[PDB]
């Protein structure tokens, strides 16, 4: 998409595909589940008892993986980018006060 | 007059992929260490029996 | 608990804190009415703020009174508040049977469709001028509407103003603000708790109620009419156990907080006194 | 836990079948769209002529 | 300046709504003082007088 | 005994904090109070509310425009004007489309 | 798509025909139909 | 059944199967019996010496 040969409609289609796949990432993150526990939706940890006495545990750290923790929120690739603004005039100069 | 298009899409995607890879590596290490624990537990059970 | 010399029992007395403004505000519900300083506020839970109806002015009973001066100065104050120099705002001015758009930019300048309009003697809005009767300003428009034979209605970005045949309009004040005026000094603020069927008015001055009303909160939160909490405990000389042997209260209490008589007294895990076994 | 796992496995298998059906729907619709597009292209050529 | 849409048989309409003429001669879309006389003949008479 | 005889009874509702006393004649309320319950349950003390509907003759669409109440009513039963009204499953006239 | 409630994917469809693409009176040679309109009370009042 | 691709007849058949199996659940509950005692038809308790 970053190529300058693409037109506005082409960029729109590409960004539609990008939005669809971002939605898939979010959906998989939200819906992945093990024994009623959302593994990818929480930033907590799990403890496993591996010995025969108390304190013999191993900790698995989970991270909340989604769009928010990876940025990508307004991944607006079909936008406009840097745009040069028009020069001021007397009409809006007086409108400013 | 900066616009709304994302500034560094490739850099952002690289950061996301790097985070995913780090978390996958951590899970793999935990899984290996858990398997080693399983093997040690089996050996200890045999010896105690 | 204190030992009662005349009877030999052990009496435990628990105090109850008088109703406070913070607790009243926490228990405030939709449609509640608060009267402080003689002005009535209606609480809104949807936005969580007090809505008020403010008239322009008018206190004197005759023409030669301060009512006209107060009305003029309040009209001027409203017009000045309508400055909005930075950005333009759109509204609508409606007479008894007709309406017109409105787009002001700054300093209360009337502009209709990019062309400056003018106000007539009777508050009429016209793009043209007859006899140089321009007076194209918010102050002049408001004065013409006030002096007009027929009232008008103005719709803006905020609340809607009604100019009567005086201007009546809604206004918003913060709950924290209203709390500040209520607790500022020895005010006569009163809060009406209304459930839509059942209503009670509580008048409290600077916090605690002074209207000879037993409003208290310490029991479990909320409002209660129990002034004092006193219950008698009898200690068995042989067994050593403690049993409840009735209670007395300053108010009636309607036996609402009545514990069972003769039930063994137990110590909670936290260390309190409780009749529950487990 | 075995009951929960059995329920999850059956549900996921049926969901996979449903997704396959959805893919079929998309393919059929897209074929119809392709034919419409060819007709529109020919109409444009005729207009140019 | 005011732009007004005259209707059949004589009428004054501004912005899709019926318009009224002031007694002094100005044109408006809202009536004030119970003096509407929404007619082009009335507008001409008011302008003349 | 309250219903059969033409007595003057009094009923007090207490929620523990809020109290209301209502006078009752032989089966009805004669205490110059509204005391109506017919809407959905509970005493809403509103005499009657009239809802005015505007019919657009161009297409036949019906919207809500105008509310009248013989009491203050705090606009409890007043829908926002300009909202398109529909017909419920039971044939009643109602505003929500669920 | 999932095994629990609310785990769905939505496919949007479009009504595609002559009406939604225009082209009704394409009229390259200048002979065709328009199927003009249906009158209303406002139209009657405007007509007088 | 919850997939939106299914049509009305498909939903009717699926619900027919569901109703049949619910009837089976009810029948098993009602008819399960031990020594003349309906174990699953009562919410009581049994005492063993």
Author numbering:
A (entry chain h): 99 to 195
B (entry chain h): 489 to 537
C (entry chain F): 196 to 360, 376 to 488
D (entry chain N): 50 to 98
E (entry chain p): 294 to 342
F (entry chain e): 391 to 488
G (entry chain N): 148 to 195
H (entry chain e): 99 to 147
Sentences from the paper on this structure:
Similar to the S. meliloti flagellar filament, the EHEC O157:H7 flagellar filament has a dimer symmetry with two flagellins in the ASU, one with an up and one with a down outer domain conformation. In addition to forming dimers with outer domains that are five and 11 subunits away, every EHEC H7 outer domain also pairs with an outer domain that is 27 subunits away. Residues N319 and N323 in the EHEC H7 flagellin were chosen for mutagenesis.
The rotating flagellar filament primarily functions as a propeller, acting as an Archimedean screw, and supercoiling of the filament is essential as rotations of a straight filament do not generate thrust. A shared feature in all four structures is the formation of symmetrical homodimers between the outer domains of flagellin subunits, with one outer domain rotated 180° relative to the other. These symmetrical dimers are the result of outer domains being able to adopt either an “up” or “down” conformation.
